[PDB]
Amino acid sequence: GPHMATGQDRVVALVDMDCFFVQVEQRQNPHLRNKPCAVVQYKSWKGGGIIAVSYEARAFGVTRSMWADDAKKLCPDLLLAQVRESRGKANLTKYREASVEVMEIMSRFAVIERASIDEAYVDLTSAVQERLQKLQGQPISADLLPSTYIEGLPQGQKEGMRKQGLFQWLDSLQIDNLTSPDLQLTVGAVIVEEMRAAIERETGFQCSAGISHNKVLAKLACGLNKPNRQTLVSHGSVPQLFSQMPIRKIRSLGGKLGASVIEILGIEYMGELTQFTESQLQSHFGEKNGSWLYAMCRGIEHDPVKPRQLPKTIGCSKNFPGKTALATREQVQWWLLQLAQELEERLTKDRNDNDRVATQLVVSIRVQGDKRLSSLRRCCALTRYDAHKMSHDAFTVIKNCNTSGTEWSPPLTMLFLCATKFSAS
DNA sequence: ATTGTGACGCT
DNA sequence: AGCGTCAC
Ligand SMILES: Nc1ncnc2c1ncn2[C@H]1C[C@H](O)[C@@H](COP(=O)(O)OP(=O)(O)OP(=O)(O)O)O1
Ligand SMILES: [Mg+2]
Ligand SMILES: [Mg+2]
Known part of the structure; x- marks a missing residue:
């Protein structure tokens, strides 16, 4: 109600x-x-x-x-x-530095959350209010949305179709209300057109985008029309969109949890979740997951766009598959040193750029034939940016896995050094 | 021999 | 803390 x-x-x-x-x-x-x-x-x-x-x-x-x-x-x-x-x-x-180019441009427009090397969420709510009060009531022209798709339209030539759907959307719009969610999303899409234009002019790089009312819908929308296009998923578009959407396509349901939702409930599509009570979903999937599913199948998700443009961890990893698995003590030491030297380089650059210092060193390994992606993960203190010290400390932390009597067995199929727990500097 | 990352949850 | 999940 x-x-x-x-x-x-x-x-x-x-x-x-x-x-x-x-x-x-x-x-x-x-x-x-x-x-x-x-x-x-x-x-x-x-x-x-x-x-x-x-x-x-x-x-x-x-x-x-x-x-x-x-x-x-x-x-x-x-x-x-x-x-x-x-x-x-x-x-x-090279790719991290290119990512920073793009993220810095995005940050001019709005607060961003770096979700990965090539993906960021954008909180456009205040930018949209500012732009709406700037408009002072005039309608939004199709010319301001040259690469935007409105999911679910037209209803009732790919570019021709795009424009038909956009016209249907804009003719319906109630620009009178500075609080209509559909209007707010449309202004959001205008700003994202501008953001994408700025990225392409200032870097050469093209991107796609989704615009909606929350992160999950925005990511889903982004996938609907690629490359070099953007998609608006309105709240009203959710029942039809979800009615044939495989559950695995929704962020966080692509793995074992989504598989269990499918198997336990005997459904295939997101929209089918609406038939269950919140208590039913919580009974199968836990309090947090159940409440999340109950809201998300209705288009509702609350996870905030976190103000975080920089990674929280700086990591260096190498797999040693097949017959390259590490089988001697000298081998393990030499590769720990290689990883630690790359880590030292990236940390020193990070400290100069971003005014922070890592304080914890995570060391992880895989042993041959072990079914898990990580066999062991132990942490120690990260007190100075010294590759020889970091590599000696990682070895000191993992050496009791060696079961032999200069040899290393079972051979090691992965090494991983991660700098974590940053503090302002 | 589907790598090298990186974020977050559980207990 | 150490382990597991998820998405590229
Ligand atoms: N499994 C992976 N291993 C290594 N690098 C990866 C992996 N997945 C993604 N990347 C890197 C390379 C990609 O250029 C970048 C962005 O990932 P992603 O957004 O899924 O694809 P993409 O940007 O290459 O294509 P798309 O146009 O579909 O977004 O991250
Ligand atoms: Mg991409
Ligand atoms: Mg991506």
């Missing part, structure tokens, strides 16, 4: 860089632009592992987590850029 809150209080956007690592390499190397091309890590085992794919290459079936030799079977003219290698491992610095 009148007291049923509808989750329409905020305007939230999710901005995701289109095939980001590919775009970084295409900016640097113009011969790669507007071509089927991918970014690969390493090169010896089956041509290297593909970690990013241009849309031209995706059209041939090339995907992430495919070996380059196999991708070339699907796409013989595929062009490749290789991740930089330093100290014997992939080094992602």
Whole structure:
């Protein structure tokens, strides 16, 4: 009724860089632009592992987590850029620095939460109020939304359809009310057009975006029309959108929890969740998950956009698969040193840029044949940015896993050093 | 031999 | 604290 809150209080956007690592390499190397091309890590085992794919290459079936030799079977003219290698491992610095370029531009418009190297949430509520009082009541022109899709429209040529749906949306709009959620979302979309234009002008990079009333819907919306487009998901669009939406497509339901929702309740689509009471969902999935599911299948989610532009952790990882697994003490020490030297470099740069110091060192390892992705995770004190000290401390922390009598067994298939617990400096 | 990250929850 | 989940 009148007291049923509808989750329409905020305007939230999710901005995701289109095939980001590919775009970084295409900016640097113009011969790669507007071509089927991918970014690969390493090169010896089956041509290297593909970690990013241009849309031209995706059209041939090339995907992430495919070996380059196999991708070339699907796409013989595929062009490749290789991740930089330093100290014997992939080094992602070029892409982190490109990400900072983009995040700093986004921060001019609004508060952002860095969700990953190429994705950020945007809290647009106050920016929209400012822009609405700036409008002082005139309507919003289609010309202000040149790359926006309105999900669910038109109802009742891809670009022609986009424009039909946008016209239907704008003709319906009630610009009289500075508190209409649909109007607020529309102004949000105008601002995100401007943000995306600024990113492309000032970096060369293109991105897609979603605009809705919360983070989950904004991320879902972002996925609906890619690349280089943005999508508005209104509250009213949720029943139809969710009526055929697989549960696994909603952020956080792509794993075991979503699988159990499907199996326990005997449903397939998000919208089917509305039939259950909050207490029923809590009985199957716990108090927190159940309340979250009850609201989310109605389009309602409360998770705030956190004011956080910088990562909370600075980590360095390397897998040693198959016969490259580490089998001697010297090997383990040398790779701990390699990881620690990259970590020291990134930490010293982080301290200069961002006025903070990490205080905890996490050391994690995998042992051969262990079913888990991480076998062991132990922490120690991080007191100075010294690679030799950090590597000696990581070894001191993990050495009691060695069961032998200069040899290391069982061989180690992953090493991981992470700097955490930052404090202002 | 589907890597190298990074965020968050549980107990 | 250490382990597990989730999403790229
Ligand atoms: N599993 C992974 N391993 C390594 N790097 C990854 C992985 N997933 C994503 N990345 C990196 C490379 C991507 O360019 C970047 C952004 O990831 P993501 O947003 O899913 O895809 P994308 O930006 O390449 O394409 P899209 O246009 O679909 O967003 O992060
Ligand atoms: Mg992306
Ligand atoms: Mg992304």
